[PDB]
Design a protein around this nucleic acid. Structure first.
Ligand SMILES: COc1cc(NS(C)(=O)=O)ccc1Nc1c2ccccc2nc2ccccc12
Ligand SMILES: COc1cc(NS(C)(=O)=O)ccc1Nc1c2ccccc2nc2ccccc12
Ligand SMILES: [Mg+2]
Ligand SMILES: [Mg+2]
Lengths: 778, 778
DNA sequence: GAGGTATGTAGGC
DNA sequence: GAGGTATGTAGGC
DNA sequence: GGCCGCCTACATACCTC
DNA sequence: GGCCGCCTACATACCTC
């Protein structure tokens, strides 16, 4: 087996005293290599002897769904391992390394004495992923196959400190493990002074002195897993065929460990499996839900919104083209993406992809290069080393307003600003965008709607001139949903049909019996048209019904001809029995594609919310835009009144400076006192000019006090009469804007109605422009 | 064979009409994939048929040195292919793809008709590497094995445009190929207006419309190689056992192609092999010489100096730690490194490595993580994903002064600033640093000298108080070299000895015949101590002379014990015959390590210069520092006189502003006219405050004219009397500094003598501090 | 005696 | 009739 | 995130005939 | 720069007895 170092005196007379170290990644492998090669000054410290090495290679499969538990009626319960589980390299490799056998149950001392290694230790990163997932699946598999090993403490793991705080003059850290504990320690402390906080989001982040200190006390910080009676049901709920069973368990939320339990764990290293599954595995599942379910407001996931934030920050200064990996590094460093690089590049490529049938109907990035056509479904995209991506500045600026991004709540990472909780847009992307995301307890499926029914719905909800406005409000208060919603017909030459409670997509075809050609210019919108012909190449008896398949379908279009026997038309017609909803030729070509919508979405707080129809999503997204417009108009009015009073103060100072003669003053304090005695209000102009996402109450309590830096910072060029006239004109313009804002807040329906109408018009104009081109605005 | 797409109708009746495309990298493979899958609207455009696909995988082996040409005395000349050439995957794979055989010579039509492909086309990037090297080796191998194929035009290649200039309103570019041609076109044009210049430093940089335009005229831009009578000697000189033969050919320089030759090439696509070898291969060889041979002044290579420039730029704002790949991306994007990423990361790791026997005696980066110990010679360094590097700010600032970097000449990349031509330091790194770099025609070997002989030499050359100053100057004018130079003893417990004209390094050992232990605490300075014991494990008859080898050598130290037979001492002593220069035990342990110095260095212009001894390097490096100090002092004096006159003007304006009353003025022009009529000189303060590497003549001709932006840009806070007093004190301080500079220019030996002495003292203090620690300054 | 074999490096592809 | 097999996506590894 | 081939320059055992 | 394993959720032929 590869990546397995055979330790000396292992699998022999001293095998029971040996230990085995399991690594989730090569970083842990390197850390273990350094620890083993340390050697000197470590008598109790484990050298390469009795240690060995095995790497889990990242994420391994769980045998809960692989087993079948068939033919248990013979009086004994036997589990048959599926061939998909048997041939996995990692699982059989670790089985061979341990020398264990599936059939035997190690209840007595000798049975576990035959094991090659006395114990197995799992060494993973302290981030939310890995511990809880990799440990979770590993020990769940161990419990499912050999519960006695967990019962007798054969399996164990080492627990590294996630966060360390070092005090100057002292050589020992706090070595805290959970972020809740670190927050409690920070808040219980009088102040965060004389302390250095170190974050270890990965084992390889530790230094040489850190790893040597860990290996000096390697006998400590190693915890043995203990099995309880209640662990079996937790394992079945968290892992297994039962899907809805874990839904009701995830919908509640993580329960923090009690103080007495933590004290017991720290005193003696016996970690129960139930507590680990309830804390670490549940937290990992919740994190996966958050990171894979797009927020209904954004219609896009956390990684996608972080990518959008990085693109907005990078391309704001210059819209010049940037390569994929440069942008990935930029968004990783600036926006604190501590997961990886390949996943980030893949997500960027998927977001920038644009072709008929693609997941992104309105990509946020204008891509240059070979992103792949509809034929491979984006699988034939080029390498990230050379693919070029640039931001769609017009579409983003008409779809995600700058002020809206200013007032959005932000996620704080290590006390620093990061991507907002949700980019609530002028139009809900959860409706336009569509994709299939299976997320650790829920499935996310969507189908695009036409940008005519939703536009009419929003216009009626906003514009009071629409006769359906009152009717739409009645529908809002009574869930009537008078206006219809239909699947988007863009980039689809077929016809959509509705039967019962499900929509269906049909391609178009032409039949020429004189030459026996089966032309299919249109095919279902989501099939890649290449895996489709592969499926039709394995379509059972249709091999005798056809001769061969020829593909002339190029990019941007589909055209496929099917060779078939001259006597095949009648037999396929009499065999397929065309129904009232689908054609016999459609059945032969599998042109029918039933579409299902699983509207599983996360609330801005972080909880799963389900929607029966898109109308619920729209009616839940609307009030957020209402509140954001109201608060944005209020903040604009407040900052404009501060700006106008500040500009009036500056103008009065410029007028009075002819006889003020402030040059004959000693320091800044004397000038400030003189100008205060002259009646000038002190304003923090560094906050007035650039509010920088300041709420109303905090902006007011910051503008109550201030300083005369605005007066003392103006140059010797702004005192000219031309500058004074320009400032007076700006005063008049901003006063007119303030009056316009004030009268906008007084409209009957709701604040910011005409603003929303203008934003809708601008964004639909930009969308139409992008439709006319191939999303390349040049 | 992998990465080989089998084209339809290939190797059959229509095989002679097929073509084969050879790609140097996967980027070219992807471009060819896009071109082949384009298909439609291209009747003459080649589809997947008759094309195939093969990859060269970048650099391949050259058969010129692999062949032996043995047993040619039988009346026929036969070349025996070495097994190292036969088992190469790429070579045998392409041989199998073509279906050719080594024994047969294809002179007639049928012999080349048996070939699977009618012709072979090499598709590589248009940068200096690839075309000239990959093409060079490929067609040299083809000529060496089958000259008739080149004679009959079997081998060919496609030539892509390196630089394209697009004119607005026109759809055709200039599609220029060589940078000389592009420069000639730019200089012959009246102006660079209404033109967009696009650089393609790689095939994948081309866009979809670019590649479709190329494939529309794929019949063009394909050039067939023609063999001449003189090509054989060029092939032998450029490739083969003859080493010195290519030295005299590289020492001359590249000869540009004549206009008539270029016109003939463009008119009919028959590229001679001699012209290609003389231009592209020679330019690639010169580029390799420049990029591999370290500049004698710098003591480091072009990539290393670009890395240092990137580190200086990145860490100047903040000395915070940065990961390896973030820094690599930063230096690639900012400093225009268009080669790759893995090589850059490897170079960064090698530069940041610090251990006994390492190449870098004074690393410019303070590294955090596992860079590897002396045992593996840096081969056990960790992954770049997690290795931490930070700049040694104190060492760099005391070794590479900021003003010196200001006045250094810079390399211009695409009209933008890049790394300087040479970082001439306060002490020549070519002496302290040492490494083994084989560079495409020359070998670079160095051995470190003690930082006591060179320090004394520089002090005597600089300080006039040293009694050897006049003697050292006499040596300079007469090559006497009175002062000695000895190998550095740092991190080496052994003793250096000199015999004849070569130094020798010996380790130390202890013998205890009572217990038969062979202890070796010290070993030669450059052997990795792990490959050494591997060599001694294959050391012929010494297997019978020993029993086994045990290694307790940890990091930072070496201790090895050798098990040997009790009756082995006398027999090894009587077998090895200890000489007067090395011991019998030293011979048994191979403790003697003869050191050779190949002082092959590139001039700042770019030419190879050889040095017989380190004294020549020192005496050539000294005048550069002399000139830089002289010009730096002159520039400082000039910029200081401009600064003092500007500050005096500002102070006079502040004094006069009490009664000036400039507020009653209309625009900036009126104020400028008034202040000019008041006698204020107009100075470009944006150049006076920050000169930004301005030469004396250009600084003077820029300071002759100017504007009153300095007067009009000062804020309303600098007019206080405290600011006036502070400015007066600054005036006095800079006047004193100007007087000090003026008296420094008048010292008898040379300008900047005491400055050099102080810089030497500071840099040696910093070096001593780094010696006391493990190059970790905390 | 003569010939053939194997890394060893940096900066590359 | 019943059971077993194979992707098919987006982020993670 | 790490398994495949060398390029150019070149002191050096080698070991069983 | 691209070959290896899946994780979670789940409409769906299937085909020869
Ligand atoms: C189990 O996962 C892996 C196994 C191997 N080796 S083997 C025995 O299957 O030949 C190699 C890699 C992996 N895991 C992978 C990743 C792990 C972490 C992060 C990214 C990964 N990306 C992978 C992509 C393809 C295949 C395996 C990957
Ligand atoms: C000859 O070089 C290569 C061959 C192959 N394939 S094969 C036919 O030998 O099985 C694959 C790759 C290469 N070349 C390599 C590289 C090429 C460009 C850039 C980096 C490369 N890094 C390599 C690292 C190891 C081995 C080959 C590499
Ligand atoms: Mg991790
Ligand atoms: Mg290249």
């Amino acid at each position: 087996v590869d990546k397995y170092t055979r330790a000396r005196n292992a699998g022999g007379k001293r095998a029971q005293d040996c230990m085995l170290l399991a690594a989730e990644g090569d970083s842990a492998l390197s850390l273990l290599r350094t620890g083993l090669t340390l050697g000197k000054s470590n008598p109790s410290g484990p050298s390469f002897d009795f240690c060995g090495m095995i790497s889990l290679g990242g994420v391994i499969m769980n045998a809960c769904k692989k087993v079948t538990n068939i033919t248990t009626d013979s009086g004994e319960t036997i589990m048959v391992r599926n061939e998909q589980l048997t041939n996995n390299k990692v699982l059989q490799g670790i089985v061979q390394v341990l020398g264990l056998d599936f059939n035997c149950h190690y209840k007595t001392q000798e049975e576990r004495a035959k094991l090659r290694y006395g114990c197995i230790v799992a060494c993973v990163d302290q981030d939310l992923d890995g511990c809880g997932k990799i440990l979770g699946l590993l020990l769940a598999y161990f419990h499912l196959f050999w519960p006695q090993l967990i019962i007798h403490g054969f399996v164990k793991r080492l627990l590294t400190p996630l966060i360390r705080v070092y005090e100057k003059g002292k050589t020992m850290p706090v070595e805290f493990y959970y972020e809740q504990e670190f927050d409690a320690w920070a808040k219980k402390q009088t102040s965060l002074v004389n302390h250095t906080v170190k974050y270890y989001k990965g084992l390889a982040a530790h230094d040489t002195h850190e790893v040597k200190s860990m290996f000096k006390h390697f006998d400590n910080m190693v915890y043995t897993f203990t099995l309880d009676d209640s662990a079996k049901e937790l394992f079945h709920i968290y892992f297994g065929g039962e899907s809805e069973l874990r839904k009701r368990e995830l919908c509640t939320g993580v329960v923090p460990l009690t103080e007495t339990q933590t004290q017991s764990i720290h005193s003696v290293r016996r970690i129960p499996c139930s507590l680990h599954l309830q804390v670490d595995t549940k937290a990992y599942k919740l994190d996966a839900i958050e990171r894979q379910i797009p927020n209904f407001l954004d219609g896009m996931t956390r990684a996608r919104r972080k990518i959008l934030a990085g693109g907005v920050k990078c391309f704001a200064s210059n819209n010049r083209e940037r390569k994929v990996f440069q942008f990935g590094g930029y968004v990783a460093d600036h926006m604190f993406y501590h997961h990886g690089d390949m996943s980030l590049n893949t997500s960027i490529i998927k977001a920038a992809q644009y072709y008929p049938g693609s997941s992104h109907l309105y990509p946020v990035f204008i891509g240059i290069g070979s992103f792949g056509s509809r034929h491979l479904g984006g699988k034939d995209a080029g390498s990230p080393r050379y693919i070029s991506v640039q931001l769609a500045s017009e579409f983003i600026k008409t779809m995600f307003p700058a002020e809206d991004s200013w007032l959005l709540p932000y996620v704080f990472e290590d006390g620093q600003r990061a991507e907002p909780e949700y980019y609530v847009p002028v139009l809900p992307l959860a409706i336009m965008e569509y994709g299939a995301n299976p997320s650790e307890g829920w499935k996310y499926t969507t189908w695009a709607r036409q940008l005519e029914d939703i536009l009419a719905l929003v216009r009626a909800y906003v514009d009071k001139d629409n006769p359906k406005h009152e009717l739409l409000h009645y529908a809002i208060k009574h869930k009537i949903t008078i206006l219809p919603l239909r699947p988007s017909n863009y980039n689809f030459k077929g016809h959509l049909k509705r039967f019962g409670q499900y929509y269906y997509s049909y391609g178009t075809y032409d039949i020429s019996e004189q030459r026996n050609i089966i032309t299919i210019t249109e095919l279902p919108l989501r099939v890649p048209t290449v895996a489709y012909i592969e499926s039709i190449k394995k379509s059972s008896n249709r091999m005798t019904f056809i001769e061969e398949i020829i593909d002339y379908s190029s990019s941007e279009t589909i055209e496929i001809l099917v060779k078939l026997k001259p006597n095949s038309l009648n037999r396929i017609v009499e065999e397929f029995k065309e129904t009232e909803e689908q054609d016999s030729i459609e059945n032969f070509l599998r042109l029918r594609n039933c579409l299902h919508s699983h509207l599983n979405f996360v609330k801005p707080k972080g909880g799963i919310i389900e929607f029966n129809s898109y109308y619920e999503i729209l009616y839940a997204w609307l009030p957020y835009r209402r509140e954001l417009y109201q608060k944005r108009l209020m903040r604009e009015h407040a900052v404009l009144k501060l700006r106008i009073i500040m500009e009036t103060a500056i103008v009065r100072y410029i007028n009075e400076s002819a006889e003020l003669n402030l040059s004959h003053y000693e320091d800044e304090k004397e000038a400030s006192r003189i100008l205060s005695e002259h009646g000038f209000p002190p304003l923090n102009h560094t906050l007035i000019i650039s509010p920088e996402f300041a709420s109303i109450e905090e902006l007011n309590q910051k503008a109550l006090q201030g300083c005369y830096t605005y007066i003392l910072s103006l140059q010797a060029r702004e005192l000219l009469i031309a500058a004074k006239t320009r400032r007076v004109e700006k005063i008049k313009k901003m006063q007119a804007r303030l009056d316009k804002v004030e009268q906008l807040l007084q409209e009957s329906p709701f604040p910011g109605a005409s603003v929303w109408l203008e934003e809708i018009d601008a964004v639909e104009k930009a969308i139409i422009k992008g439709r006319n081109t191939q999303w390349k605005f040049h």
